Amino acid sequence: AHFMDVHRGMHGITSDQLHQAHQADLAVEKDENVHFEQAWADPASGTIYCLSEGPSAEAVQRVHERAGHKADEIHEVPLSA
Amino acid sequence: AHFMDVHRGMHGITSDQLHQAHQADLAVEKDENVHFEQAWADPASGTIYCLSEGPSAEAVQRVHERAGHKADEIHEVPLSA
Ligand code: NI
Ligand code: NI
Ligand code: NI
Ligand code: NI
């Protein structure tokens, strides 16, 4: 399955910080067979969008939680175009 | 530049309908130098996410408007990982 998740209220995100948050997820995703495909950030609003492939939203969230940043919002996105 | 926009209230949207919306955007995006790279939809919550490339949020929204569906939110995502 695929998921879009959102982390809000981020303080002063830089490309370095985004790179590291993403790397922290990638480092431990194997333990849930999750694949963090892509992350985009809006540093002005303080928001990180994460696209992942995984068995379930719960799995994706267990990964974020271990990497110390549980997503504020997550939706399965079974449709794409 | 890069943008992520969100449409809500699309509960129960089908693959055909997402494809239709997407095609409607693509059909008029070129005039604004906008390209919709990816569209994902969650028919359960009724949430659509669109990743686009373009000169501004204004342009992207003008395209959505001509296509018949203004986005409820649009944010620039200058950072990606
Ligand atoms: Ni995928
Ligand atoms: Ni497409
Ligand atoms: Ni918002
Ligand atoms: Ni914003």
Numbering used by the authors:
A (entry chain B), B (entry chain A): 2 to 82
Task: Quote the original article.
Here we showed that the 82-residue hypothetical protein SCO4226 is a nickel binding protein. The overall structure of SCO4226 adopts a ferredoxin-like fold with an α+β structure: five β-strands (β1-5) packing against two α-helices (α1-2). The N-terminal four β-strands β1-4 of one subunit form an antiparallel β-sheet, whereas the C-terminal β5 swaps to the corresponding β-sheet (β1′-4′) of the symmetric subunit, completing an extended antiparallel β-sheet of five strands. Each asymmetric unit contains a dimer of SCO4226, with a buried interface area of about 1100 Å2 on each subunit.
In the structure of Ni-SCO4226, four nickel ions are assigned at the dimer interface, with Ni-1 and Ni-4 on one side, and Ni-2 and Ni-3 on the other. In addition, one citrate molecule is bound to Ni-1 via coordinate bonds. In the dimeric structure of Ni-SCO4226, four nickel ions and one citrate molecule were identified in the electron density map. These four nickel ions are all surface exposed on the dimer interface with varying occupancies from 0.82 to 0.98. Ni-1 and Ni-2 interact with residues within one dimer whereas Ni-3 and Ni-4 are coordinated by residues from two adjacent dimers by symmetric operation. Specifically, Ni-1 is hexa-coordinated by His76-Nδ1, Asp43′-Oδ2, Ser46′-Oγ, and the O4, O7 and O6 atoms of the citrate molecule. Ni-2 is penta-coordinated by His23-Nε2, Ala82′-OXT, and three water molecules. Ni-3 of an octahedral geometry is hexa-coordinated by His3′-Nε2 and Glu38′-Oε2 of one dimer, His12″-Nε2 of the adjacent dimer, and three water molecules (residues from subunit A of the adjacent dimer were labeled with a double prime). Ni-4 coordination is formed by His20′-Nε2 of one dimer, Glu74″-Oε1, Glu74″-Oε2 of the adjacent dimer and three water molecules. The distances for all coordinate bonds are well within the expected range (2.06-2.46 Å). Although the crystal was soaked in a buffer of NiSO4 as high as 0.8 M, the four nickel-binding sites have an occupancy from 0.82 to 0.98.
